[PDB]
Structures are given as C-alpha cells and as structure tokens.
Design a protein around this motif. Structure first.
Motif, PDB file in Angstrom:
ATOM      1  N   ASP A  28       0.779  -1.228   0.000  1.00 54.20           N
ATOM      2  CA  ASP A  28       0.000   0.000   0.000  1.00 54.20           C
ATOM      3  C   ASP A  28       0.810   1.279   0.000  1.00 54.20           C
ATOM      4  N   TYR A  29       2.110   1.222   0.377  1.00 55.94           N
ATOM      5  CA  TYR A  29       2.953   2.408   0.458  1.00 55.94           C
ATOM      6  C   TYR A  29       4.297   2.245  -0.265  1.00 55.94           C
ATOM      7  N   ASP A  30       4.896   3.373  -0.651  1.00 54.47           N
ATOM      8  CA  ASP A  30       6.238   3.355  -1.224  1.00 54.47           C
ATOM      9  C   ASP A  30       7.066   3.509   0.039  1.00 54.47           C
ATOM     10  N   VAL A  31       7.625   2.415   0.483  1.00 54.85           N
ATOM     11  CA  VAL A  31       8.351   2.322   1.747  1.00 54.85           C
ATOM     12  C   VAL A  31       9.787   1.853   1.526  1.00 54.85           C
ATOM     13  N   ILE A  32      10.697   2.334   2.361  1.00 56.49           N
ATOM     14  CA  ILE A  32      12.082   1.877   2.374  1.00 56.49           C
ATOM     15  C   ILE A  32      12.436   1.569   3.808  1.00 56.49           C
ATOM     16  N   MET A  33      13.356   0.622   3.983  1.00 53.55           N
ATOM     17  CA  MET A  33      13.964   0.232   5.247  1.00 53.55           C
ATOM     18  C   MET A  33      15.369   0.826   5.250  1.00 53.55           C
ATOM     19  N   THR A  34      15.740   1.453   6.375  1.00 57.85           N
ATOM     20  CA  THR A  34      17.052   2.058   6.541  1.00 57.85           C
ATOM     21  C   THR A  34      17.594   1.967   7.956  1.00 57.85           C
ATOM     22  N   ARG A  35      18.890   2.235   8.081  1.00 57.81           N
ATOM     23  CA  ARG A  35      19.628   2.352   9.315  1.00 57.81           C
ATOM     24  C   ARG A  35      20.848   3.211   9.060  1.00 57.81           C
ATOM     25  N   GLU A  36      21.405   3.796  10.105  1.00 57.65           N
ATOM     26  CA  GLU A  36      22.568   4.664   9.958  1.00 57.65           C
ATOM     27  C   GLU A  36      23.823   3.793  10.041  1.00 57.65           C
ATOM     28  N   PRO A  37      24.889   4.084   9.254  1.00 53.44           N
ATOM     29  CA  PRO A  37      25.013   5.137   8.210  1.00 53.44           C
ATOM     30  C   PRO A  37      24.224   4.898   6.912  1.00 53.44           C
ATOM     31  N   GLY A  38      23.825   3.656   6.652  1.00 53.57           N
ATOM     32  CA  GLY A  38      23.018   3.285   5.493  1.00 53.57           C
ATOM     33  C   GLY A  38      23.610   3.501   4.107  1.00 53.57           C
ATOM     34  N   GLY A  39      24.914   3.347   3.976  1.00 57.46           N
ATOM     35  CA  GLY A  39      25.588   3.472   2.690  1.00 57.46           C
ATOM     36  C   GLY A  39      26.025   4.867   2.302  1.00 57.46           C
ATOM     37  N   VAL A  40      25.758   5.864   3.152  1.00 56.89           N
ATOM     38  CA  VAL A  40      26.167   7.248   2.894  1.00 56.89           C
ATOM     39  C   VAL A  40      27.707   7.320   3.091  1.00 56.89           C
ATOM     40  N   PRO A  41      28.482   7.684   2.036  1.00 53.99           N
ATOM     41  CA  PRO A  41      29.962   7.670   2.133  1.00 53.99           C
ATOM     42  C   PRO A  41      30.596   8.186   3.423  1.00 53.99           C
ATOM     43  N   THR A  42      30.330   9.452   3.768  1.00 50.06           N
ATOM     44  CA  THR A  42      30.853  10.084   4.983  1.00 50.06           C
ATOM     45  C   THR A  42      30.437   9.348   6.255  1.00 50.06           C
ATOM     46  N   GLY A  43      29.178   8.894   6.306  1.00 50.11           N
ATOM     47  CA  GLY A  43      28.648   8.132   7.433  1.00 50.11           C
ATOM     48  C   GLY A  43      29.358   6.795   7.567  1.00 50.11           C
ATOM     49  N   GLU A  44      29.693   6.141   6.405  1.00 49.47           N
ATOM     50  CA  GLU A  44      30.391   4.842   6.380  1.00 49.47           C
ATOM     51  C   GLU A  44      31.802   4.993   6.938  1.00 49.47           C
ATOM     52  N   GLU A  45      32.462   6.135   6.635  1.00 49.27           N
ATOM     53  CA  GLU A  45      33.816   6.453   7.117  1.00 49.27           C
ATOM     54  C   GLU A  45      33.815   6.643   8.613  1.00 49.27           C
ATOM     55  N   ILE A  46      32.764   7.280   9.132  1.00 48.81           N
ATOM     56  CA  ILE A  46      32.581   7.542  10.565  1.00 48.81           C
ATOM     57  C   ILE A  46      32.396   6.222  11.339  1.00 48.81           C
ATOM     58  N   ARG A  47      31.590   5.314  10.744  1.00 47.68           N
ATOM     59  CA  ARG A  47      31.270   3.993  11.277  1.00 47.68           C
ATOM     60  C   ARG A  47      32.539   3.198  11.488  1.00 47.68           C
ATOM     61  N   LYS A  48      33.461   3.251  10.525  1.00 45.54           N
ATOM     62  CA  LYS A  48      34.772   2.587  10.558  1.00 45.54           C
ATOM     63  C   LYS A  48      35.591   3.090  11.740  1.00 45.54           C
TER      64      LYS A  48
END
Ligand SMILES: Cc1cn([C@H]2CCCN([C@H](CC(C)C)c3ccc(C(=O)O)c(Oc4cccc(Cl)c4)c3)C2)c(=O)[nH]c1=O
Ligand SMILES: Cc1cn([C@H]2CCCN([C@H](CC(C)C)c3ccc(C(=O)O)c(Oc4cccc(Cl)c4)c3)C2)c(=O)[nH]c1=O
Lengths: 195, 198
Positions: A28-48
């Motif tokens: 019924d909805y256009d839905v996405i599942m996410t979590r941080e960093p979620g593939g965002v380059p800068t966020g992925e670097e922070i996660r490391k």
C-alpha cells in the motif's frame, strides 16, 4: 510521506519486526527500510572509526553517532521523504539517548542537546518502541556487565518514554514475534491512515 | 598550569605569533604548543573525512571539528595541564563559533552548545585574539600564499567581533595590524602578565 523510527534494546526482535512490517506496508505504500550510516559515504567512514576505535572517549563516540545520523538524515532520509516515501529507520535519536546518554553515563539531556544539533528539528513522525523486559530480552539474545548494560539500556528507554509521550508508541515485545509484528503494523497503519 | 588558545582569521599572523611566542615562553615555563587534531589517531582520521568531504553538510562538519577537539583535549591538552604545563593551542572552540557558527550561518549559540558537549566545561583560561582588519588580513593572505573568499574572510572577522563582544572577560585582543614583531611582543607581554598573576 512519513518518518518512522524503531527503537529498543537487543533481543526486542526489532530487526525481525522492521522486515515483516516492511513486507506488509510495501503493498500500500512506497516504503524503504534504513539504518545509519546506510551506505552514505561520509557516514560509512565515521562507522569505521567507531568500530576501529580502541577505548574511544564516550563523548567522541556520541559525536560520531550524531555525525553519521546527520549524514544519513540529509542524504538518505530527507530525499526519500521528498519522494513521498514511508521511511522505516532502524535506530535514531533515542538510541543515542539510551546508549550514550543513559547506559554510558554522559546524561540523557546532554546527548539530547548534541542530537538536536544533528537532527535540527527533524524528529520522527512516529517512534515504535519495542518494549521487551530485560528477562525476555536476555533470553532472546541471540556475561555480567553485558547483562548490566542491557538492563541500563532498558532503564534509559523507560526514562525517555516517561518524559516524552507523543510520537512514541510502546508495543509489547514480550509477546511471540507474530503478535509484535501485528501490533506494530496496526500501530503504523492507524498513524498513516490519519495522515 | 594554563590553557591559552589563539584565535583569528587567516592573514592575522597567528601561526607566526604562536611559534615565536612559544619559542620565548619555553625559556621560562614548562610549555607545549599544539593544534587539533595534533597527531591524535582518531582526530587525524576525522580530519581526513573533513578534508575529503565534497560540499559536506555544515552541521556534520561542525560535529567533526568538535569530535577532533574532544580527542585532542582528552589525549593531549588535559594530561599536559595535569603535569602543570602551559598549553598554547592554535584554534579551539571560538574557531568553530566564528567559522561554523557565524560565517557558515549555523548560529554561534548552536555551535556553542555542540562545543560545550565536546569541551565539557574546559574553556581556555586565556584567549589571544589576533585582531587584524579585513584589509590588512586580505593583503597578508596574498604574501603568505576572489569575492566569495573576500566575503567569507570578512564574515569570519565579523563573527569573531560578535564573540569577543559577548565574552570580553576571556579574551585579550592584540592589534594584529602592526608589524609581526610588535604583534609577537604584545602577545608575549599579554601572556606573561596573565601567567605572573597565577
Ligand atoms: C544508532 C545508535 C546505535 N547505538 C548502538 C546500538 C547497539 C549496537 N551498538 C554497537 C556499538 C559498537 C561500538 C560495539 C554497534 C553495533 C554494530 C554496528 C555496525 O553498524 O556494524 C555499529 O556501528 C555503527 C552503527 C551506527 C552508526 C555508526 Cl557511526 C556506527 C555499532 C550501537 C548507540 O549506542 N548509539 C546510536 O546512536
Ligand atoms: C579548529 C577549526 C578550524 N576551522 C577552520 C580554520 C581555517 C582553516 N579551515 C580549513 C577548512 C577546510 C575544510 C577547507 C582547514 C585548513 C587546514 C586543515 C588541516 O588541518 O590541514 C583543516 O583540517 C582540520 C583542521 C582542524 C581540525 C580538523 Cl577535524 C580538520 C581545515 C578550518 C574551522 O572552521 N573550525 C574549527 O573548529
């Protein structure tokens, strides 16, 4: 559109709940599942840095979770909301509050001020709190200190909900997961169908 | 012990002043000179993200400067202060306030709240503000190395003026329009006078 976050300690069934609820909402909805960093380059670097960090100061770690949160929000969440999507986000502000604020001892209100700088008024439209007892949670996983940290995370979540009861919807996560999935789905649909 | 920070825009002669001041103070005090990240592993990794960042969100960048600040403070500054040292720090909180807060438009008070989380009450005992005019600053920038950079430079100066106006008691404004020898002497004299009243 809608920004729905999922909160709870380990053993709350959170990850299973998001997956099954996404499967039902997608009809019924256009839905996405996410979590941080979620593939965002800068966020992925922070996660490391967070994951490579040996005995990292608690306040630094808190600021890194908040910097990853900002990146994910700005580059993933906000554009999905603009496309009219329902955004199911596994962990957001309240996770930093319960973990960094409460369990780690920085203080909830200090970690809140940090996270309000990061989110800049972008609070979830709805927050699903998977209310699992420490006893059920412990059994659901998967040592002492770990047992104590798990209990403290739960005490922190109790403190967050007691002080703010508007966007939060506490779902009984002590039930079998089929009932936790149904109660969460019903809570979401009721919110979505009221706009 | 003492925690002395140095603030100012580019072209204020800051780097020369701190280097020459440190070199004179080392003769009478147990002093160290540092800047963020200052070799602290986690801080160095953060610096790389900041510098590799393409059109990075301003609030993320602000949080990264604050995370680098915390690491440097905890691993370098605080232990030196505990050993009784005089700590000369090139750029600290006020740099985030003038740059991220003021010039970038986040707001000084918001960047302050972020930085108070990072510093956790550890404000400088003394802040040397190298008060250079935009005109002199712009000319010094050409010798040491557009309209957009000219405007940002002026906003950084205007921001430092707003910070200093609201917190005069912590700062000591040194006239950085003078030749650098006089800027070095005025800064040295300001520091010595503060240190001798301890
Ligand atoms: C969102 C959020 C989560 N948490 C907790 C939730 C329970 C899991 N933990 C751990 C902590 C780790 C240092 C051992 C965890 C587990 C798996 C991952 C991984 O992604 O592989 C992880 O890395 C992450 C996850 C999200 C953002 C960043 Cl910057 C790094 C972090 C993180 C917090 O304490 N604060 C927050 O703000
Ligand atoms: C301390 C501090 C400084 N600044 C400014 C001061 C004027 C110079 N700039 C630039 C900004 C760059 C992204 C284009 C600059 C210049 C050289 C370096 C480098 O180290 O090579 C640099 O990286 C740094 C410097 C300090 C801490 C970190 Cl995390 C990174 C940053 C940074 C701020 O805007 N905010 C602060 O809080």
């Amino acid at each position: 559109s809608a920004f729905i976050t999922f909160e709870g300690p380990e053993g709350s069934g959170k990850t299973t709940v998001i997956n099954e609820v996404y499967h039902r909402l997608v009809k019924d909805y256009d839905v996405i599942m996410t979590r941080e960093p979620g593939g965002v380059p800068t966020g992925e670097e922070i996660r490391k840095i967070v994951l490579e960090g040996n005995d990292m100061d608690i306040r630094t770690e808190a600021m890194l979770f908040a910097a990853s949160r900002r990146e994910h929000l700005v580059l993933k969440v906000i554009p999905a909301l603009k496309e009219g999507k329902v955004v199911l986000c596994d962990r957001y502000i309240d996770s930093s509050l319960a973990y960094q604020g409460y369990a780690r001892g920085i203080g909830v209100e200090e970690v809140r001020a940090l996270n309000e700088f990061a989110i800049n008024g972008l609070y979830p439209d709805l927050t699903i709190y998977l209310n699992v007892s420490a006893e059920v949670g412990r059994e659901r996983i998967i040592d002492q200190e770990d047992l104590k940290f798990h209990e403290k995370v739960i005490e922190g979540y109790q403190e967050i909900i007691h002080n703010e009861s508007q966007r939060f919807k506490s779902v009984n996560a002590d039930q079998p997961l089929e009932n936790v999935v149904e109660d969460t789905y019903q809570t979401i649909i009721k919110y979505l169908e009221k706009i």
